[PDB]
Amino acid sequence: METHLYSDLAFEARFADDEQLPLHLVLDQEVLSNEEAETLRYVYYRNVDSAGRSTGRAPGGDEDDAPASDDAEDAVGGDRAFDRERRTWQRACFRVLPRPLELLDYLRQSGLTVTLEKEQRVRMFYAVFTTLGLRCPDNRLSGAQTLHLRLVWPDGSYRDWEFLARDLLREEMEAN
Amino acid sequence: FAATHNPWASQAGCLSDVLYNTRHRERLGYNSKFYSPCAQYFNTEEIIA
Amino acid sequence: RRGYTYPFGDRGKARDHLAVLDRTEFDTDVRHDAEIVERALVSAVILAKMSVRETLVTAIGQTEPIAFVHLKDTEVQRIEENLEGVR
Amino acid sequence: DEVARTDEWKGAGVSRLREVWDVQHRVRLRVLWYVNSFWRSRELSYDDHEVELYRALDAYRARIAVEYVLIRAVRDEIYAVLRRDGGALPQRFACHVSRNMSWRVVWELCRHALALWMDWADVRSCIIKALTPRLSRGAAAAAQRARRQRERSAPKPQELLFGPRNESGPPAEQTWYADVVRCVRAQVDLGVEVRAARCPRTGLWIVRDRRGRLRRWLSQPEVCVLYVTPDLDFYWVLPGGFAVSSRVTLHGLAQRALRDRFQNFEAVLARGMHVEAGRQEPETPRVSGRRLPFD
Amino acid sequence: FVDALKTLCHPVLHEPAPCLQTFTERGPPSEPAMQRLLECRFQQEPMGG
Amino acid sequence: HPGFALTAVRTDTFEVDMLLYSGKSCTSVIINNPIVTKEERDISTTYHVTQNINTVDMGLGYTSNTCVAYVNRVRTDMGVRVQDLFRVFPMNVYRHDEVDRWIRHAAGVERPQLLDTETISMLTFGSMSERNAAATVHGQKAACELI
Amino acid sequence: MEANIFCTFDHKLSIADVGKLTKLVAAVVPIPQRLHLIKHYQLGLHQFVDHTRGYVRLRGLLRNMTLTLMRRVEGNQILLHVPTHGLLYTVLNTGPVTWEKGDALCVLPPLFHGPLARENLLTLGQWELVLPWIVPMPLALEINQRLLIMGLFSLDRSYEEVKAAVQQLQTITFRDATFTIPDPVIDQHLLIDMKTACLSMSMVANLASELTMTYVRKLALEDSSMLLVKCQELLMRLDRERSVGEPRTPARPQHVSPDDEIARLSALFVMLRQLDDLIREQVVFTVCDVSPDNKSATCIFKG
Amino acid sequence: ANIFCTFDHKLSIADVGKLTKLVAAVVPIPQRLHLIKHYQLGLHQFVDHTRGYVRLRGLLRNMTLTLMRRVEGNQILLHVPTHGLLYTVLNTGPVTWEKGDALCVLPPLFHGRENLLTLGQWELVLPWIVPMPLALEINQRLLIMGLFSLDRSYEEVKAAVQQLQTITFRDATFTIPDPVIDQHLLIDMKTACLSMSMVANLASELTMTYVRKLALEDSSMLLVKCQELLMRLDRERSVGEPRTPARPQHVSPDDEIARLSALFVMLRQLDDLIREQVVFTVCDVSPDNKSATCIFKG
């Protein structure tokens, strides 16, 4: 749970420049296997706006909008395009808990107090705690914003999923 | 204590170097039988050795 | 702030005048405002005169009078008329 | 004395626990909300106008289609070139054949195989695996170097006699990826790695297992195979080694879409990695539940 | 000079390819004073307007 | 012509053979017995022998003379290289940085490239900063100083 | 306590081998344990040497080992002498580093020297005698400092940008010789060192008073010199990377207090000593004599 | 270990009598050598008007220390003490020792010129041997006094330096010389102060980025505390400015390398200042107290 606290402080420190707010997640056997959880190297996230444009690219478009050319010597705008694409991903902190646990009981074993509307227990073989940043530049955030989650393992393989802001925030934002 | 008194002869890639250095002469096509007075001054590898 | 940024010819006296500007605070009672705004204004005028490197006064027992800087005489007298109307 | 942020973070605690699925409903994860997050203090505005959601869904649809449009491009290219040459196709892979075979039924089996491959092709097909290395950064420079080496003039006697070694050409054995479709019991194997070399006696292709054994599915009548080369040349091969040959064009897609869909990842320095590049890695820094933690 | 023609008009003198090759192989200078000498730019442009 | 003249001053070093004459019994020398001191390590022992000698001058005036009889070489180059003041006064800079850089580039002197312990020592305490030439053909550089 | 240690070679020795051993007399050989009798397998660093494992691990292992001096090869027996603090000994230097009178020496794993030849000492089958480098304090300090800097710089970066910077960092020039640090790897020891450094820097930033913070700015306004220009380059680049703010002049001191300054500086010196301990090795020899061929020296042993 | 020192000047019997009173003093030598001239005794070699306390401290670090033994007619006998043994030494400091003190060596701040042995512009100057707390206190007082030097126009800072100069140590009081002369500070003290200020300034900037770098690997509670502390420091520091401190992420490699190397090279300057050299331990002191028996810790 230290990862969530540190990430909250870090995002608070960076909010003036980044305009990204923190989002705390828990992962278990429903998203990754035990081996994948034991060998995880990095977690990366990307912000995508309502128009399908990634945050890290130029607002007015790029040379990348042009069609590809089938020329091996050109690759696909090779080095410059590779640099532009890599630039849009951002790295997040994470910690792995490799043994079966009950989440609420674990949180109460730490210093946290827990008070839910319904206190149903949730049991998981393992847990990965990570925090992702969601971008809100205008101090407004649109429900159509999309967020991507990437997990990377030592051999360089990766797995991607994407989420849209409505599912993440519908009742939570309406509550505030 | 000047830099050089002939830029076209004392530099690593100058005209007289490629012309008279035996290492450059080998990459050109030259007849090794002919004698050359300039060779002793321009064969930099031999002088270094 | 603007005075702290500016490259004065000498930083020494500018430093203490900026300190005086920083020290200013208003009291709860209204009878003390005149003197504190007087000293704040005189330090600000000294800083402004230094910025355009005019020969500010230095006579024994004398002090810099309060006046606008680099305004046209007509505009100065218009502002004086406005202040007189306030009075 | 003052109070630390960690103490109030602990005491304030959480009050939320919610399950969120991804857009395609593949994966579910839980979100925790802390009542002491700085998120609370901001003046945040939120709105979900319908047109923005509609546009977002259209963009998401566009993101998914990138692989399938490429597969369809390969298919319609196959049909186009087949029409172009009037259905006459030459042998390109080494295999012995007999004139007594009824080639009509193997034509029919080829048609069935085309239908089945189009039914089963996926993101893990040989096309995507073959083009993915092209997106790596070193790829463009390597292609420039390969072209400059390929077309240089013949050495003069001087350079043969003196100086450096002769510049080596490309290796004779290449690495290809293939999609294998079997009809008799419907089964398609996508993205299989194969080694291709050209026979000396006749200039045909011979494909081998990565272990070196000969791949034998040219001899099996019920299977057709699609090969893709790193030069983005593709062969659609029916049994007997007779093939349909064309190039995998991809100018129907923007650079951004292909790139951001499946550009390869590149690592950053972390625990256990050598600071020098290319060194032999030590053991992987696993964190495990079988053992006591090292501390 | 007329006697020198046996050398002065041989093709090797007028061919600068080895000089250019070694000039590129040595690479641009890294000394900070030389950097000001390195930064020129030339652009082709259409003559239309 | 910049409007002023200048005089150069240079020092050159010669290698000579000397000749001296000394009168008979011009000085009295008294020697004392040697003293031996031991210094023992584990692998070896070092011995130190010291002899004390006393000299007194018995001349009413100068009883010895010297002549510089012969010379055969010049150690220095007798050149015209001028003294680099930037080496002997390394801390001084022009107060405006752009003009300082322009002057240093024009004179052919290189700024210290990065902040380092050897550079700090050179600036504060001083060091043999000049470094040797790749090849020396005329001997030491007799630097000319200008007035 | 054991002063003399017997070592037995489990391998038959030729004439050349005993010649090499009698040439090696008075060299410094590290031992894992101060036993009375050991096998030759325990001699030197070969029992621990492992590429693809890194430099820092070997450095730690060597720092834990005990040092001995070699003498008396006597026909399949060699005698090792453990020095005592404060006495005077003769030491043989087997590395390429140039010793000088009066400096302090530290023990470190061998670096990679330029000629690439290295050449072996005794080689008994698969076993080989590899000795550590006895090195003067400035070079050891530089090695540790650069290793830590490389570790801090390298994290979270791609191989591409770190390639040139690391190639530059690995190369040492010391007294007209060039060495390279052979195998740096980001490891647990280096990470805990980095964590300690980060904590110390955070405490230094927290403790520093206003006048020790503003002293450099006051000098930059008051004085001009090459050293100050070099400092101001770094500070100006940092400030410009932060904001378009021009150099602000400092203000009149608000709270002058000698006792507060004294206490705060004492705390700062505590933190600075803690940060310095990360890179300063243990001194093991102080030299005061040297052979003109730079093959041996007379040294005082320090624990 | 015996060291012989010879005088090539012309001693008088008064000079010998003045010299014999220093029979157990501590005399530093530039280097260990069997037979030396009298010019190499003491600190007189290094003294010059452009350098001061810091340079002499640094030089005294690497020098070798010797004790004196009584005199021939013309030659001085010096003894290099071995570690762990015990010797008798002379109290040349301004304060009185007592049992159990740890003694440090310092350059002399002032004299008395009462008994200087002068031989034609050469004179024998010996360092101070003082207990460790006094050495620490005066060292850091000098360092603080150097930082105040740049703005001594105000009256309160003049009162501060006035209080800072005076020192009392168990029934002894004396005044430390002011390191600033003619409104200027000597080069060595200036470099010391510049280095420590640079260290503080560099740390304040770099610490946050390296906290993030390490927290990416592991997020222990210590890094959380460091993050909170740095956030508090930035908030308090920025109270006089608008908006945000706005630290960026995309730092160039060369800038990072230069900053780290500068931080460490500045750290290397201070290493002579942060540590005192403790070489003696007094077991027994005479009632006269001008001499004592000590164990050598060199």
From Swiss-Prot, chain A:
<comment type="subunit">
    <text>Interacts (via C-terminus) with capsid vertex component 2/CVC2.</text>
</comment>
<feature type="compositionally biased region" description="Acidic residues">
    <location>
        <begin position="61"/>
        <end position="76"/>
    </location>
</feature>
<comment type="function">
    <text>Capsid vertex-specific component that plays a role during viral DNA encapsidation, assuring correct genome cleavage and presumably stabilizing capsids that contain full-length viral genomes.</text>
</comment>
<feature type="region of interest" description="Disordered">
    <location>
        <begin position="52"/>
        <end position="77"/>
    </location>
</feature>
<protein>
    <recommendedName>
        <fullName>Capsid vertex component 1</fullName>
    </recommendedName>
</protein>
<comment type="similarity">
    <text>Belongs to the herpesviridae CVC1 protein family.</text>
</comment>
Curated annotation (Swiss-Prot), chain B:
<comment type="subunit">
    <text>Homomultimer. Makes the hexons and eleven out of twelve pentons. Interacts with triplex proteins 1/TRX1 and 2/TRX2; adjacent capsomers are linked together in groups of three by triplexes, heterotrimeric complexes composed of one molecule of TRX1 and two molecules of TRX2. Interacts with scaffold protein; this interaction allows efficient MCP transport to the host nucleus. Interacts with capsid vertex component 2/CVC2. Interacts with the small capsomere-interacting protein/SCP.</text>
</comment>
<comment type="function">
    <text>Self-assembles to form an icosahedral capsid with a T=16 symmetry, about 200 nm in diameter, and consisting of 150 hexons and 12 pentons (total of 162 capsomers). Hexons form the edges and faces of the capsid and are each composed of six MCP molecules. In contrast, one penton is found at each of the 12 vertices. Eleven of the pentons are MCP pentamers, while the last vertex is occupied by the portal complex.</text>
</comment>
<protein>
    <recommendedName>
        <fullName>Major capsid protein</fullName>
    </recommendedName>
</protein>
<comment type="similarity">
    <text>Belongs to the herpesviridae major capsid protein family.</text>
</comment>
From Swiss-Prot, chain C:
<comment type="similarity">
    <text>Belongs to the herpesviridae large structural phosphoprotein family.</text>
</comment>
<comment type="function">
    <text>Participates in the last steps of viral maturation and release. Associates with nuclear capsids prior to DNA encapsidation and later preserves the integrity of nucleocapsids through secondary envelopment at the assembly compartment. Interacts with host CCNA2 and thereby blocks the onset of lytic gene expression to promote establishment of a quiescent state of infection in undifferentiated cells.</text>
</comment>
<protein>
    <recommendedName>
        <fullName>Large structural phosphoprotein</fullName>
    </recommendedName>
</protein>
<comment type="subunit">
    <text>Interacts with host BICD1 and RAB6A. Interacts with small capsid protein UL48A; this interaction links together the capsid and pp150. Interacts with host CCNA2.</text>
</comment>
From Swiss-Prot, chain G:
<dbReference type="InterPro" id="IPR002690">
    <property type="entry name" value="Herpes_capsid_2"/>
</dbReference>
<dbReference type="GO" id="GO:0042025">
    <property type="term" value="C:host cell nucleus"/>
</dbReference>
<comment type="function">
    <text>Structural component of the T=16 icosahedral capsid. The capsid is composed of pentamers and hexamers of major capsid protein/MCP, which are linked together by heterotrimers called triplexes. These triplexes are formed by a single molecule of triplex protein 1/TRX1 and two copies of triplex protein 2/TRX2. Additionally, TRX1 is required for efficient transport of TRX2 to the nucleus, which is the site of capsid assembly.</text>
</comment>
<keyword id="KW-1048">Host nucleus</keyword>
<dbReference type="Pfam" id="PF01802">
    <property type="entry name" value="Herpes_V23"/>
</dbReference>
<keyword id="KW-0167">Capsid protein</keyword>
<dbReference type="GO" id="GO:0019028">
    <property type="term" value="C:viral capsid"/>
</dbReference>
<dbReference type="GO" id="GO:0005198">
    <property type="term" value="F:structural molecule activity"/>
</dbReference>
<protein>
    <recommendedName>
        <fullName>Triplex capsid protein 2</fullName>
    </recommendedName>
</protein>
<comment type="subunit">
    <text>Interacts with TRX1 and major capisd protein/MCP.</text>
</comment>
<keyword id="KW-0946">Virion</keyword>
<comment type="similarity">
    <text>Belongs to the herpesviridae TRX2 protein family.</text>
</comment>
